[PDB]
Design a protein around this ligand. Structure first.
Ligand SMILES: Nc1nc2c(ncn2[C@@H]2O[C@H](COP(=O)(O)OP(=O)(O)CP(=O)(O)O)[C@@H](O)[C@H]2O)c(=O)[nH]1
Ligand SMILES: [Mg+2]
Length: 169
């Protein structure tokens, strides 16, 4: 009944779609399918409010288009996703944050840093590295596994709460 527009961004391969599908389907999509839907709706009660989440699951490597920016500009909050076994994707968070600041023309956009694939061994990005980056940005850091669902609902609900901290809903 209250709509929240959420946008999921991050490098190609970090699990943006798998995260969204876990929230939507309670299932782990184990293969890469480039034709998967990118626009989802999820109705859930968060702190006693009935929330209709309108989720845009973006393409990580899509190049500039006015249309791409226009779709992102509708977002009220952003999940910025890297994978904990993908150092480049972690470093690339700088690019996605700058992109969001530009598209929204704002330094205070609701945002959660998400470190996905926590089910995997020998991670290459330590939790303390991610905590430090999120601290530098003034945003929460949440670790997730789209495979097990660990942290997935936390990431989306925390983003909803970050939006409420920024604007009346
Ligand atoms: N072990 C594990 N694998 C995952 C996890 N999340 C996604 N993957 C796997 O990573 C690969 C890429 O997942 P996908 O969700 O398509 O990534 P994406 O970020 O949406 C790719 P694009 O930006 O091109 O749309 C898939 O093989 C998928 O199953 C995870 O939490 N754990
Ligand atoms: Mg995807």
């Amino acid at each position: 009944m209250t709509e929240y527009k959420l946008v999921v961004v991050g490098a190609g391969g970090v699990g943006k779609s798998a995260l969204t599908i876990q929230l939507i389907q309670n299932h782990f999509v184990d293969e890469y399918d480039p034709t998967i839907e990118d626009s989802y709706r999820k109705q859930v009660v968060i702190d006693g409010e009935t929330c209709l989440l309108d989720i845009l699951d973006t393409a990580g490597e899509e190049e500039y288009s006015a249309m791409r920016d226009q779709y992102m500009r509708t977002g009220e909050g952003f999940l910025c996703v890297f994978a904990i076994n993908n150092t480049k994707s972690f470093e690339d968070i700088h690019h996605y944050r700058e992109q969001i600041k530009r598209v929204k023309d704002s330094e205070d956009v609701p945002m959660v840093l998400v470190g996905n694939k926590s089910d995997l061994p020998s991670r290459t990005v330590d939790t303390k590295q991610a905590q430090d980056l999120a601290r530098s940005y003034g945003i929460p850091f949440i670790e997730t596994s789209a495979k097990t669902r660990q942290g997935v609902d936390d990431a989306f609900y925390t983003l909803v709460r970050e939006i409420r901290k920024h604007k009346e809903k």
